[PDB]
RNA sequence: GAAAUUGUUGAAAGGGAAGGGCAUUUGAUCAGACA
RNA sequence: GGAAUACUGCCAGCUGGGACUGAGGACUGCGACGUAAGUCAAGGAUGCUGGCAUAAUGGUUAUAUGCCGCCCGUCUUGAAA
RNA sequence: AAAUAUGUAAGAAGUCCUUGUUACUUAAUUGAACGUGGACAUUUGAAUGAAGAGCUUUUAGUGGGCCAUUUUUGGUAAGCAGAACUGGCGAUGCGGGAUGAACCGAACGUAGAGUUAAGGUGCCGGAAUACACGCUCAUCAGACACCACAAAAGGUGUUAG
RNA sequence: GCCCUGAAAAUGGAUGGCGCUCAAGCGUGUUACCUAUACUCUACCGUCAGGGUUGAUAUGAUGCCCUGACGAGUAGGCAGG
RNA sequence: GAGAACAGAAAUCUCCAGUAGAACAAAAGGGUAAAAGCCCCCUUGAUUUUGAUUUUCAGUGUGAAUACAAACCAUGAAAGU
RNA sequence: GGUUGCGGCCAUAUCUACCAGAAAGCACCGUUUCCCGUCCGAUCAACUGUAGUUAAGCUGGUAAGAGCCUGACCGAGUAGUGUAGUGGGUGACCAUACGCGAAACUCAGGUGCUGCAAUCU
């Protein structure tokens, strides 16, 4: 026998193809594992993983978040990749030119980008254009802006938001939520 | 029906499956519980040198 | 403990700044190998001096070979031993042809007559009884008489087959 | 019933050291503490205010606060399978600077030296510590020192 | 580096046998464990 | 027109239960492969 | 005085008997021997000869024989109980 | 005043120089805190290891435990009652202790060859009716840990002191 | 020290049995020998892991090829059937 | 301990010695000598605001406690408390 | 070197008995108008530095002194202890193996070191 020092037959714990079942996504994966295996280029390697990512690890990148990244010093001509969908943001009043490459473009986002004379590339087109990912700027959206993570870590003095359905006063705002009713959290 | 009362038996076995996680360390720890007179001043101190360093890139 | 060799073991008190060249002490040691023999050395040295192996060093280990390995000699043996209920000093005389032989059968004898395992014995001195008539123990004096001759009555030959066709004879 | 008050079981621990009772000598108060300083913790039973609880006796921590008559020390207490951060408001009579780092600091200040003092010569440094190595060959002499030969001793009683 | 590069050696049981009738005592007491100094080579060679 | 359970015929084994595992002798029975 | 021998150790010294295994399926590597051409025991068995072509070998089955084998389900610290 | 246990430290989040910020603080641009600018790289600061490290969410079963060595309380005691640390059994077969939950050995995919462990080798039963030195003769001998008990006290039986 | 007295209980009975007395008993030494699901080497199954390979013009890209380690299991979880 | 009318074992007066052998409400254990004990002087901080922290811990609550911040005061020559 | 004021470590500074102390300084010491405190100008307050004294304080030295401090293969590798065994023993307990290791004892040595400021044959 063997004094094992570590749990046996452990799975690596990382996705390895998408759990998604879409052909096209399956094809883009085909492109990039090829590209990853044969180009020693970091970008293709990161891109391949993001493809496997489930919906929650793929938060939307907005078109305003886009415009801001372009305002980085020396970044205004880069083409931005977003392995996910791109949404529109009425709140910005002046969107730049550039080229965004992403999986989905909402109707309004595509509009706004094209209106400023930008261009909307799919990842496979992005590939042919920059097989080593030259001049690419990768953007991710906010994962912990989900509503779910509000409730993560619920406990005393954690200050983190109840799992509650109806709300307003007389919904969990008395005993243990204020000094005058028993105590506070 | 009396029964067992207390034992620590087996408890450090369990404690060791998933750690005794070391204590976790950070550059810049929280000023939590620090003297308010200090902290008040320190703020203005910082606000200042900030202003000074924007003043270096005018 | 086994089939013994006899060793000179020399050791000394790890040197110091203020005391380099410490005194050097020797033991003869009866043991089966030099590993047991160095162990034994430290075992007795910490019974006599302030040392322990940790703070001391072995200097030399050498096997002492028997002077005249085919001369019958009368050994007197002194021993210290632990019985079940208290400890005890002894003198035996053993007749054999080497000190190493002799210590082999001492150990056997202590074990068999007094049930003393090897841990519980201390050899004090082993020394050749020079002139006879200093031989004390009669189970040895016996063998020193002039023109000694004795028969070996009732011979048992060891059979090699399970069956025999004779009826044996213990003649001799 | 059982008893488990704050200072329970501390009979000897907060006791005072033989022939060392009374006023605390003044150097205890002249000593100075800065944030980041590493202190050792030891309750002075003569000083009831600002006392560490027994568990923190003999513990070393880092100052995180300096107030009028106290320092705030933060210790990692391990409750369960894990450490939590604990913050202690101790009066200065229960704290002393640790020497747990003096050998490190002495080591570094000195490592800067023979590092420059080597470079500015012609490299070849070697300044990691190494464990006790086995000792080397050597030749012990007999001159003035022939081996004394001891045997084991008989059994005797003296009583 | 040199020594960690080697996987641990995987020896068979000794071919001669262990010397000794009971292993889990010290070499010095007729058993097999402990420092047995240069007598290590005889063992390993029977196990290699 | 199953099973429990029964009659008959055939084959076999049985010194205070029977049934089971690994293995092979002996009997019965059988597939495949040769070309 | 000069040897021998035992004991312990070493040899990239030679050599006999016996057992189990023969995964892999063009080539590709590291070598060895040769003046060479070639050869080889060097990244996993081939060569030669015979017997049967069948219940011979094998499967199944029943029985016999050696060793072994408590009744499952459960609740229990603990069940063949 | 031990041993065993036990806190902290062994650097880039480091060491040194220069001299900004503030309402705190000093007699005091004094200090305190946070900095800007500058100097020194893997013998960059002990060992050994690392089938990597870190982090998040959600959920089962469980919440009668029992045992062994050691420490240990109550009890005359218990196959009794109760704690400490570890290792076990429970949840686990396999080899050994004839037998057996917990001892000893050793932890399990299907198999071949080899070697062993603990324990054995007269016959049951695989394996020396082996070698060697003593001892012991029992008109209830003795015969291997845990373990399946014996004591004070005696012997001019015998052995060595 | 071994042996003997001290030494009394209930069905007939247990160094495991037979039996053993210069032992097949007690103490101690030395060898050799027997044999575990363990150790070494090899094949095969599976699990985990790391590499390789979309180039058409034939057959699985969840595939194909190489390599290494690992395999006990109640309550219980998940997976592929 | 040594001394002083009534005065005695014990009244009140003095001096020497005195590491705490006392006292600090209370159980006990810590602690304390120009004090933490005894005598006196002046007092209400046993007050107002809302957080942090330690013990028990789920790192909830409660009890009790600790160090600060913002007030207003007490005392003292003052540092302070 | 002395001494004083303020000290730091807080007996190698303490304790018991005796002796010695130049010079300065400390001291004891004189007084009761004034602030101030008492049963008592003893303490405490003030005034003189004048009238007096090294007696005491203080400092130092002596002592097979008490105590205290330090050291040592002095005791002791003792006691105790972590680890090991199908070790001994009816038990109680005890050897052994790889380690860690005291306390009393005994013997020697020692008896304040020192910071800032002022002063002094
Ligand atoms: Mg929101
Ligand atoms: Mg009940
Ligand atoms: Mg019970
Ligand atoms: Mg319970
Ligand atoms: Mg000789
Ligand atoms: Mg209690
Ligand atoms: Mg005092
Ligand atoms: Mg208080
Ligand atoms: Mg061999
Ligand atoms: Mg063999
Ligand atoms: Mg052989
Ligand atoms: Mg055995
Ligand atoms: Mg081999
Ligand atoms: Mg019909
Ligand atoms: Mg069969
Ligand atoms: Mg083949
Ligand atoms: Mg093949
Ligand atoms: Mg035919
Ligand atoms: Mg056929
Ligand atoms: Mg045929
Ligand atoms: Mg049939
Ligand atoms: Mg059958
Ligand atoms: Mg059976
Ligand atoms: Mg049931
Ligand atoms: Mg029951
Ligand atoms: Mg440690
Ligand atoms: Mg390291
Ligand atoms: Mg390593
Ligand atoms: Mg790794
Ligand atoms: Mg859960
Ligand atoms: Mg749960
Ligand atoms: Mg409960
Ligand atoms: Mg539950
Ligand atoms: Mg156990
Ligand atoms: Mg259960
Ligand atoms: Mg098991
Ligand atoms: Mg069995
Ligand atoms: Mg038995
Ligand atoms: Mg064991
Ligand atoms: Mg039988
Ligand atoms: Mg046999
Ligand atoms: Mg033989
Ligand atoms: Mg026993
Ligand atoms: Mg007796
Ligand atoms: Mg007798
Ligand atoms: Mg018997
Ligand atoms: Mg038998
Ligand atoms: Mg025997
Ligand atoms: Mg197998
Ligand atoms: Mg499994
Ligand atoms: Mg009290
Ligand atoms: Mg005072
Ligand atoms: Mg109140
Ligand atoms: Mg509370
Ligand atoms: Mg309470
Ligand atoms: Mg004068
Ligand atoms: Mg008056
Ligand atoms: Mg006066
Ligand atoms: Mg006055
Ligand atoms: Mg005088
Ligand atoms: Mg004075
Ligand atoms: Mg003295
Ligand atoms: Mg003892
Ligand atoms: Mg011990
Ligand atoms: Mg034992
Ligand atoms: Mg001992």
Swiss-Prot record, chain A:
PANTHER family: 60S RIBOSOMAL PROTEIN L18 (PTHR10934), LARGE RIBOSOMAL SUBUNIT PROTEIN EL18 (PTHR10934:SF2). Keywords: Cytoplasm, Isopeptide bond, Methylation, Ribonucleoprotein, Ribosomal protein, Ubl conjugation. One of its GO terms (cellular component) is cytosol. It is found in: Cytoplasm. This is Large ribosomal subunit protein eL18A. One of its GO terms (biological process) is cytoplasmic translation. Its main location: cytoplasm. It comes from the Eukaryota. The gene is RPL18A. Component of the large ribosomal subunit (LSU). Mature yeast ribosomes consist of a small (40S) and a large (60S) subunit. The 40S small subunit contains 1 molecule of ribosomal RNA (18S rRNA) and 33 different proteins (encoded by 57 genes). The large 60S subunit contains 3 rRNA molecules (25S, 5.8S and 5S rRNA) and 46 different proteins (encoded by 81 genes). eL18 interacts with NAP1. There are 2 genes for eL18 in yeast. Component of the ribosome, a large ribonucleoprotein complex responsible for the synthesis of proteins in the cell. The small ribosomal subunit (SSU) binds messenger RNAs (mRNAs) and translates the encoded message by selecting cognate aminoacyl-transfer RNA (tRNA) molecules. The large subunit (LSU) contains the ribosomal catalytic site termed the peptidyl transferase center (PTC), which catalyzes the formation of peptide bonds, thereby polymerizing the amino acids delivered by tRNAs into a polypeptide chain. It holds the Pfam family Ribosomal_L18. The modification N6,N6,N6-trimethyllysine is found at residue 49. There is a cross-link at residue 115 (Glycyl lysine isopeptide (Lys-Gly) (interchain with G-Cter in ubiquitin)).
Swiss-Prot record, chain B:
The gene is RPL29. The lineage of its organism: Eukaryota, Fungi, Dikarya, Ascomycota, Saccharomycotina. Residues 1-36 are annotated as: Disordered. Coiled coil: none annotated. Residues 1-25 have a biased composition (Basic residues). There is a cross-link at residue 51 (Glycyl lysine isopeptide (Lys-Gly) (interchain with G-Cter in ubiquitin)). This is Large ribosomal subunit protein eL29. The keyword Aminoacyl-tRNA synthetase does not apply. Its main location: cytoplasm. Belongs to the eukaryotic ribosomal protein eL29 family. It comes from Saccharomyces cerevisiae (strain ATCC 204508 / S288c) (Baker's yeast).
From Swiss-Prot, chain C:
GO terms for cellular component: cytosol; cytosolic large ribosomal subunit. The modification Phosphoserine is found at residue 32. Component of the large ribosomal subunit (LSU). Mature yeast ribosomes consist of a small (40S) and a large (60S) subunit. The 40S small subunit contains 1 molecule of ribosomal RNA (18S rRNA) and 33 different proteins (encoded by 57 genes). The large 60S subunit contains 3 rRNA molecules (25S, 5.8S and 5S rRNA) and 46 different proteins (encoded by 81 genes). eL20 forms multiple interactions with RNA and proteins in the central protuberance, connecting components of core functional centers that are located far apart. It holds the Pfam family Ribosomal_L18A. Keywords: Cytoplasm, Isopeptide bond, Phosphoprotein, Ribonucleoprotein, Ribosomal protein, Ubl conjugation. Component of the ribosome, a large ribonucleoprotein complex responsible for the synthesis of proteins in the cell. The small ribosomal subunit (SSU) binds messenger RNAs (mRNAs) and translates the encoded message by selecting cognate aminoacyl-transfer RNA (tRNA) molecules. The large subunit (LSU) contains the ribosomal catalytic site termed the peptidyl transferase center (PTC), which catalyzes the formation of peptide bonds, thereby polymerizing the amino acids delivered by tRNAs into a polypeptide chain. Present with 54300 molecules/cell in log phase SD medium.
Curated annotation (Swiss-Prot), chain E:
Coiled coil: none annotated. It is found in: Cytoplasm. Present with 101000 molecules/cell in log phase SD medium. There are 2 genes for uL30 in yeast. Component of the large ribosomal subunit (LSU). Mature yeast ribosomes consist of a small (40S) and a large (60S) subunit. The 40S small subunit contains 1 molecule of ribosomal RNA (18S rRNA) and 33 different proteins (encoded by 57 genes). The large 60S subunit contains 3 rRNA molecules (25S, 5.8S and 5S rRNA) and 46 different proteins (encoded by 81 genes). Component of the ribosome, a large ribonucleoprotein complex responsible for the synthesis of proteins in the cell. The small ribosomal subunit (SSU) binds messenger RNAs (mRNAs) and translates the encoded message by selecting cognate aminoacyl-transfer RNA (tRNA) molecules. The large subunit (LSU) contains the ribosomal catalytic site termed the peptidyl transferase center (PTC), which catalyzes the formation of peptide bonds, thereby polymerizing the amino acids delivered by tRNAs into a polypeptide chain. Belongs to the universal ribosomal protein uL30 family. This is Large ribosomal subunit protein uL30A. The gene is RPL7A. The chain holds residues 197 to 244 of 244 of the full protein.
């Amino acid at each position: 026998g063997i004094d094992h020092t570590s749990k046996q037959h452990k799975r690596s714990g990382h996705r390895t193809a998408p759990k998604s079942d879409n052909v096209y996504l399956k094809l883009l994966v085909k492109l990039y594992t090829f590209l990853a295996r044969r180009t020693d280029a970091p970008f293709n390697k990161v891109v391949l993983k993001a493809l496997f990512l489930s919906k929650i690890n793929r938060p939307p990148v907005s078109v305003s978040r886009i415009a801001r990244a372009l305002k980085q010093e020396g970044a205004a001509n880069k083409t931005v990749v977003v392995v996910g969908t791109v949404t529109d943001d009425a709140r910005i009043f002046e969107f730049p030119k550039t080229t965004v490459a992403a999986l989905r473009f909402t109707a309004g986002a595509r509009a706004k980008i094209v209106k400023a004379g930008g261009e909307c590339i799919t990842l496979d087109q992005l590939a042919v254009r920059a097989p080593k990912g030259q001049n690419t700027l990768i953007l991710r959206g906010p994962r912990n802006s989900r509503e779910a993570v509000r409730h993560f870590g619920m406990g005393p003095h954690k200050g983190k938001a109840p799992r509650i359905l109806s709300t307003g006063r007389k919904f969990e705002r008395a005993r243990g939520r204020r000094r005058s009713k028993g105590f506070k959290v | 029906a009396k029964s067992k009362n207390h034992t620590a038996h087996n408890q450090t076995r369990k404690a060791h499956r998933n750690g005794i996680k070391k204590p976790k360390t950070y550059k810049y720890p929280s000023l939590k519980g620090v003297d308010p007179k200090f902290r008040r001043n320190h703020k203005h101190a910082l606000h200042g040198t900030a202003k000074a360093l924007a003043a270096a890139k005018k | 403990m086994a089939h013994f060799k006899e060793y000179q073991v020399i050791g000394r008190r790890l040197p110091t700044e203020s005391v380099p060249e410490p005194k050097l002490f020797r033991m003869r040691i009866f043991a089966s190998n030099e590993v047991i023999a160095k162990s034994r050395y430290w075992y007795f040295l910490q019974k006599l001096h302030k040392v322990k192996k940790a703070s001391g060093e072995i200097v030399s280990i050498n096997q002492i070979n028997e002077a005249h390995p085919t001369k019958v000699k009368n050994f007197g043996v002194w021993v210290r031993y632990d019985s079940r209920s208290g400890t005890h000093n002894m003198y035996k005389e053993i007749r054999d042809v080497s000190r190493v032989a002799a210590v082999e059968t001492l150990y056997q004898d202590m074990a068999a007559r007094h049930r003393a395992r090897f841990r519980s014995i201390h050899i004090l001195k082993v020394a050749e009884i020079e002139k006879t008539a200093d031989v004390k123990r009669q189970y040895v004096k016996q063998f020193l008489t002039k023109d000694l001759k004795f028969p070996l009555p009732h011979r048992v030959q060891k059979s090699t087959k399970t069956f025999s066709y004779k009826r044996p004879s213990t003649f001799y | 019933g059982k008893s488990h008050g704050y200072r329970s079981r501390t009979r000897y621990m907060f006791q005072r050291d033989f022939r060392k009772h009374g006023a605390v000598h003044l150097s205890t108060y002249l000593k100075v503490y800065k944030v980041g300083d590493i202190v050792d913790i030891k309750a002075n039973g003569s000083i009831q205010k600002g006392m560490p609880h027994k568990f923190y006796q003999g513990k070393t921590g880092v100052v995180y606060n300096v107030t009028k008559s106290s320092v705030g020390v933060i210790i990692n207490k391990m409750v369960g399978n894990r450490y939590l951060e604990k913050r202690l408001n101790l009066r200065v009579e229960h704290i002393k600077h640790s020497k747990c780092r003096q050998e490190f600091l002495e080591r570094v200040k000195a490592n800067a030296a023979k590092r420059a003092e080597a470079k500015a010569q012609g490299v070849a440094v070697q300044l990691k510590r190494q464990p006790a190595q086995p000792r080397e060959s050597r030749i012990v002499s007999t001159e003035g020192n022939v081996p004394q030969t001891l045997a084991p001793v008989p059994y005797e009683t003296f009583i | 580096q040199a020594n960690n590069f080697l996987w641990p050696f995987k020896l068979s049981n000794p071919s001669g046998g262990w010397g000794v009738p009971r292993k889990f005592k010290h070499f010095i007491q007729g058993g097999s464990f402990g420092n047995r100094e240069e007598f290590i080579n005889k063992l390993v060679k029977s196990m290699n």
